[PDB]
């Protein structure tokens, strides 16, 4: 009960590049992703899907 | 109300008009600090340690 959550929250998040890039040699995956202030986004488990 | 709302008529229509009853807009500033200091930045970037 001390280290638990009985609240409504997500587990897996997906975001898209707001600024899509279409150049000859690069794609800028431009995310405007804000971390939840009562959430903990694990930079250990943050990856891209192509 | 003509004597209450305004001071009695002297110059009935003056274009060259100073402010006394006609109000000059609010005089109050709100000042905030900076995330970075004025003198604590000279030690690093040009020497080696880059600041970001």
């Amino acid at each position: 009960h001390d280290v638990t959550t009985d609240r409504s929250q997500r587990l897996t998040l997906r975001f898209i590049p707001v600024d899509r890039e279409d150049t000859a040699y690069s794609y800028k995956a431009r995310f405007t992703l804000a971390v939840g202030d009562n959430r903990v986004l694990d930079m250990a488990s943050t990856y891209f899907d192509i | 109300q003509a004597a209450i709302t305004t001071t009695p008529r002297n110059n009935l229509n003056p274009r060259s008009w100073p402010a006394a009853l006609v109000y000059q807009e609010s005089p109050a500033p709100t000042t905030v600090v900076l995330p970075r200091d004025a003198q604590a930045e000279v030690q690093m970037t040009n020497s080696g340690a880059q600041l970001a």
Partner: protein, 50 residues
């Protein structure tokens, strides 16, 4: 004509890329200000017209 004795140079366009690296490692334009801080490009070698 000597190109220096009258200030009459000719070869002032035919460059490509210049890397000014201070003390053999840290770059001078490396203050994030430009798109290529490591090697500031003089005349582009046709990379992407945009």
């Amino acid at each position: 004509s000597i190109p220096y004795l009258d200030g009459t140079f000719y070869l002032n366009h035919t460059f490509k890329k210049v890397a000014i690296t201070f003390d053999s490692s840290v770059s001078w334009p490396g203050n994030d200000r430009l798109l290529t801080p490591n090697e500031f490009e003089i005349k582009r070698s046709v990379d992407g017209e945009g």
